[PDB]
Point group: C6
Chain length 221, copies 6
């Protein structure tokens, strides 16, 4: 990775042994849970395309998800090549070539070119672009591996409201929907799918009720 | 995070693999105990909005508390926008735009803007403001998840005074009350709820008795 | 914490994740044994009031001792305010205000003020002053939680002298007494409370006998 | 290893105790699984020939693979000596001798010569060349130790498609074939070896079907 | 501790959390085995009197040995005060006072004075002097806690020579004797106390036989 | 140890707590296996004589091997003193004395002299010389502790060839023989000691057969 600074210039170091270990462990332990994506994002802070490819390569098993992840990278690289068509001509000294999708993914570029792209007067953040493409594929994998729908989340007749809200928002996290759709699920299904004893109490609170007030109201079931 | 210095300028680094691991572990182990908040505060020392969002994202489960935490952030961001109304105009070179609540929470701002806000001649500590908002929501979660009241804390007939004082102050820690209210509980309920054998001894000591003297007096029950 | 240097200027960093973890672990494992105090002192080397408060806040349970610790801090802060009466007047540029007990304890001061006090031409070591006050309270907690007296330490009829000396000096460590009192216990009770077979041998050695010579003499009981 | 920088010059450090430990552990745990190679590549980032030889030497057992690895290094060193024939003459001051295959492998060169080769105005990356030769031998070891063929990977009659795709791409990873051959296996054998119930559904999707769409289609077997 | 450098000046840091932990663990695990002393010496590399006192304070139990260790420190400090008599006079600016035994042990000196003594044009290594005194006391503790003599080490009738030599040199390590005495034990007792079958073979080899040749000769008992 | 650099000057630090721990652990776990020597070499990278002596001192038990190791050091130091006879005369300012074998082993030299020898215009690498002497003694210990000969390594009648080659090269690693002798064992005993079914197949392949081709040929026994 490359760690930035305020006065002077940055440095290029290797992915620390404990970063590699933590990434392998979280995949063995949690596989494709929604919280694995932020763990990957934080373990790959300041990573170059080579550093990001190194992380995905350390995954044993989960090969159907790794292949789906490559197909997503292909789509984002082919979209980049359509928006950014490279120009024919010899590259002048001082300046550097503009990157293609295969250079962002690390396939047709060198580590020196990646470092040179990320470290420039006008910076070319190829490490952040490739990471965005990977996280896109990882969110698809998470949504594909979720075995439930937010529509099936109903409160049990004797289940505490706090346990139902915990299962509600975990299920919503893995839903393939824009924020506006999720707000409609948040403001409609939570009360609509609560048990009859809770549902009546929540419906009396009205439209301005916070989650805190709703949880306080359904304490005695 | 950004680690400050005395002579020169600061540096911007990533959240270390062991900081991420310790935060995930303390949530699995202790969930919403009052001592988890200082652990979060110390693990997020010098954090930017992105670094703070990264920490909350690594939480698996506890989704009702995470949603309550978002609603608290919304309230503090809407209060910030009322106190600090942004001005219409093109931002001049050298200077930078004044932050909105959505920039402090990391939603409508970039990492570069967050670093630029925290590192300035007149500093804009967006990392500390967002952290204050998070700790506010975390204290509400702790108070909401406490299953007891300081009023129900009575000393057992054969329970050593030291064990009753340990249960008294743990229960008080999670109480939703200002310091003045807590001092009234400290100076009234401790002696009032002690067992008859202890209560008489503590009442003889009077008003100037320290906790140390009270604990020394109730040694032989 | 703030790590000092020889040529140049110091830096202000956060309490490392392993320092926080080691402190929580030693409290779960050993609670208020005399050796916990030096562990705290070494884990809080170069700490500011905020860093010291962070450490005490991470303690789960042991709330009677934490309250006793606050009352000790109150006494030392009120003694500081009596010895160091602050003066009324606007603080001049360049110079900084003189600290009160509530600034040393971190309650009515900011991290920037604490850093500014510890880093100055004439230094104001508020971090070391608060740490001294905490260690005072911790020694009171250790003495309060010791369940034995040095007077009750007698050697068993078949107990090896080495085991009796180990129990003697551990018990003396938690005694509330000045060094001069402890030397009188060291030079009087050790031989006086040894078993009759050992006591006679030690009494023949005389007044100039070292602990090494005493331990060598009582090898064969 | 040697960690590069942007402004100034690099430094030469030792292989950290945890890098050595992680490498020994991954060999005891996973032996010659395809994901061990990227772990080696990341643990040997910026390594000199001596640092790379140190890593292979720490392997206990797996001696048939270590001997096969030496024979591969011999072939790559003899190919280097054919492409790069050294010239007879005394080496001038300032300049340095051009490396032979035995200098790249660390046998007939010193650590100072390796550091001098990697750190130069026109750099001679002997550390990266030797690492390429090692990874070549490691890929041969992985292919030699794979106990299955991509041709034998058929879907079970009651086996979920996701489990069959996981076993398909793991088996393909260890296949000794160029990327073009692997694409023919990817576009031909996956559907051809699926169970009759899945095979019919996949064949209806056609030629433009992604892995994501194929996995979505075979959800209900 | 204080870590030295070549170009510039040194820095003063705290005893790392893992150094404190490793020291506590080796005492719980091995107590006063001869190999604990080098572990202490390496964990206290570059330590000041305060850092050395911090390490001994973290020892739980072993209080008879800790008291014996204080008495040894007293003897070395009183010997220092006899060899180095301090002079009466006000200390001039720039220069610093010459240390007493109580300043070397950290009792009547401050951390700043210890740093100032170790960092000077003519250096006063108080950290190394106190460490020498501690290691002296630790070697006495090791010799006092050894439960065997080199004279009692005889080879078993069916015991392999290698096992007898291992028990011989471990027992010699804890012997209270100068190097010349130990060489006489090495050149006399090893062969003299070997079993009759080995003793005859070793006696035929003569006076110039190495340990390697002796071990090779007694392979078949 | 002393970590070298490119622009400027090196630094002298202590052996890290985890380096000391890893060295003690590998000796408890593997004792004198051939792979322990490279672990020692990598854990002692950039070590001074004092740092190397510190490592050997941390070994509990294995005292016959530690004594054999001292006798080897004695031989290499007496050979150094024969090749490098020191000259009588007062050492001039600026220059430093030429080292004897007892200075290289750390017995008659100080840490400052060792640092001064390794850091010089014409460098005197006493740390590397002593390390070479130690590794010589360690290889003798490994050869002395090997309980088998390469001549006794025969393939089982039902044992897979891969398992026989693994046992062949592990046994050869601990053989006391020059590289030319080992090549004769590699090119003669491997095929000569294979089982009759394998031996015939390997003999048909001829003289140019690689280990990879030999292992591929004996797959079906
Ligand atoms: C020098 S560029 C680089 N270096 N390494 C990698 C990727 C890293 C990787 C990516 C991924 F999406 C999932 C992974 F599991 C691994 N490794 C791999 O393909 C190795 C691999 C993992 N399983 C397999 C199953 C079958 C197989 O035959 C190979 C593999 N790339 C890289 C290669 C191709 C691409 C495109 C997607 C653009 C075609 C991108 C990067
Ligand atoms: C680029 S800004 C950013 N990046 N990440 C985050 C927060 C981080 C987070 C915050 C929190 F209070 C609790 C969390 F668990 C996580 N992540 C999330 O929402 C992800 C998430 C966690 N569970 C869920 C259940 C349902 C769901 O659909 C999503 C989630 N934000 C962020 C987003 C919104 C907000 C407002 C509160 C202002 C609306 C603030 C920050
Ligand atoms: C921004 S200053 C600061 N920040 N944090 C702290 C202390 C840190 C702390 C101190 C202590 F002696 C024992 C502790 F366990 C914790 N935290 C606390 O009180 C939190 C706490 C721990 N259990 C409780 C049980 C009941 C309760 O209602 C609260 C708590 N202070 C701080 C507060 C007051 C004081 C005085 C003693 C001067 C009144 C000093 C510091
Ligand atoms: C100062 S150069 C250096 N330093 N160390 C090494 C290699 C490192 C190593 C390489 C490898 F491919 C596999 C290994 F297991 C180890 N160590 C070794 O041979 C030691 C070793 C491991 N098992 C053995 C079984 C039998 C035996 O008699 C010895 C060994 N070389 C090195 C030596 C030779 C070569 C050529 C391949 C060019 C002939 C290259 C490097
Ligand atoms: C600011 S100087 C300093 N700071 N801490 C220490 C020593 C550190 C220590 C030394 C030792 F030899 C053995 C130890 F276990 C601890 N701590 C202690 O005495 C605490 C201690 C450990 N068990 C005890 C049993 C009884 C008791 O009443 C106290 C204790 N000194 C220090 C004190 C005295 C001396 C002389 C030997 C010169 C009199 C030297 C240093
Ligand atoms: C300030 S020089 C230094 N500092 N420490 C050491 C060695 C380090 C050591 C070396 C070794 F080969 C094996 C070891 F186990 C330890 N320690 C030791 O002898 C301690 C030791 C380990 N077991 C023993 C059994 C009996 C005994 O009476 C002592 C010991 N030397 C050192 C001493 C002598 C020599 C010569 C070989 C030249 C005579 C070299 C260094
Ligand atoms: Cl690791
Ligand atoms: Cl509930
Ligand atoms: Cl979407
Ligand atoms: Cl609730
Ligand atoms: Cl970790
Ligand atoms: Cl009590
Ligand atoms: Cl409040
Ligand atoms: Cl009590
Ligand atoms: Cl940790
Ligand atoms: Cl005894
Ligand atoms: Cl006292
Ligand atoms: Cl004893
Ligand atoms: Cl390690
Ligand atoms: Cl499936
Ligand atoms: Cl190929
Ligand atoms: Cl699926
Ligand atoms: Cl630790
Ligand atoms: Cl033997
Ligand atoms: Cl002696
Ligand atoms: Cl032997
Ligand atoms: Cl450690
Ligand atoms: Cl085989
Ligand atoms: Cl040889
Ligand atoms: Cl094979």
């Amino acid at each position: 990775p490359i760690v930035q600074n305020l006065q002077g210039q940055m440095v290029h170091q290797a992915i620390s042994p404990r970063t590699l270990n933590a990434w392998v462990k979280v995949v063995e332990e949690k596989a494709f849970s929604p919280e694995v994506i932020p763990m990957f994002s934080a373990l790959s802070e300041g990573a170059t395309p080579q550093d990001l490819n190194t992380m995905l390569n350390t995954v044993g098993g989960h090969q159907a998800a790794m292949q789906m992840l490559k197909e997503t990278i292909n789509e984002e690289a082919a979209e980049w090549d359509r928006l950014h068509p490279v120009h024919a001509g010899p590259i002048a000294p001082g300046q550097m070539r503009e990157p293609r999708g295969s250079d962002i993914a690390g396939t047709t570029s060198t580590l020196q070119e990646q470092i040179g792209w990320m470290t420039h007067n006008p910076p070319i953040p190829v490490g952040e672009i490739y990471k965005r493409w990977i996280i896109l594929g990882l969110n698809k994998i998470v949504r594909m591996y979720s075995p439930t729908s937010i529509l099936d989340i109903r409160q049990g007749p004797k289940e505490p409201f706090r346990d139902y809200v915990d299962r509600f928002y975990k299920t919503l996290r893995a839903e393939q929907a824009s924020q506006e759709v999720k707000n409609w699920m948040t403001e409609t299904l939570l009360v609509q799918n609560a048990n009859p004893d809770c549902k009546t109490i929540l419906k009396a609170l009205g439209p301005g009720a916070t989650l805190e007030e709703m949880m306080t109201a359904c304490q005695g079931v």
